[PDB]
């Protein structure tokens, strides 16, 4: 899903 991409970007940024 496209609307999940913006969440994946948050992961590797903060994880």
């Amino acid at each position, epitope marked *: 899903n*496209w*609307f999940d991409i*913006t969440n994946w970007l948050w992961y590797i940024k*903060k994880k």
Partner: antibody, heavy 124, light 109 residues
């Protein structure tokens, strides 16, 4: 917090093209998707497309493919919506929305932040 | 892709009464990716519920979301004069986001 300011109203002719801007203010700009939603007089909401500014690739609605170009200018923190081959049915209020920001940086997917809306009148 | 149908079309309720709006989907919505928005005349849509049931920031707890898959429900427990407007549902379980035709909630007198 996040604020979205759109450009003024516009009056276009059938067959021409129109371009609407959306200047964001506050928070992060690269890693948050900006979507565009139109609404005709008396009708309802309609999703047109979105873009994640950190990527040049966008995501358009299959109905509008061939007429919608959504590009983001990170240098000015401004999203752009462009519609070509205008027809009278395109006469609507064009809102620019941004996904919601939850606890910490974890983003939501619904449209929490919105602009004031641009009245695009396609007539002759 | 997914066609959302909102019910009923128009709803006439008095302040203090209980409100229930239904949003049915032609197919299953992935991960309950359903959102409810409110829009008043002349203004922009205001987010109420995201994730089918999670409440947005600054929204009173009298708004409650329920359901999943093909049927979702927005419930307004006690109605107030500032709760009468148009309500939309929106699915974002697929890359092609879509909205409902709208449910207007007016005042009964």
């Amino acid at each position: 917090q996040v604020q979205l300011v759109q450009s003024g109203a516009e009056v276009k002719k059938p067959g021409s093209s129109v371009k609407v801007s959306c200047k964001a203010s506050g928070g992060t700009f690269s890693s948050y998707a900006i979507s565009w939603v139109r609404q005709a007089p008396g009708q309802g909401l309609e999703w047109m497309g979105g873009i994640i500014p950190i990527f040049g690739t966008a995501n358009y609605a299959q109905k509008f493919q061939g007429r919608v170009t959504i590009t983001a200018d990170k240098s000015t923190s401004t999203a752009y919506m462009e519609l070509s081959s205008l027809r009278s049915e395109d006469t609507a209020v064009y809102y620019c929305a941004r996904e919601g920001e939850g606890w910490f940086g974890k983003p939501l997917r619904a449209f929490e932040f919105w602009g004031q809306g641009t009245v695009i009148t396609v007539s002759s | 892709e997914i066609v959302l149908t909102q019910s009923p079309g128009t709803l006439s309720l008095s302040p203090g009464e209980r409100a229930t709006l239904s949003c049915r989907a032609s197919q299953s919505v992935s991960s309950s990716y359903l959102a409810w928005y409110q829009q008043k005349p002349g203004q922009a849509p205001r987010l109420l519920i995201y994730g089918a049931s999670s409440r947005a920031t600054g929204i009173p707890d009298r708004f409650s979301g329920s359901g999943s898959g093909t049927d979702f429900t927005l419930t307004i427990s006690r109605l107030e004069p500032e709760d009468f407007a148009v309500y939309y549902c929106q699915q974002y379980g697929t890359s092609q986001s879509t909205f409902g035709q709208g449910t207007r909630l007016e005042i009964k007198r």
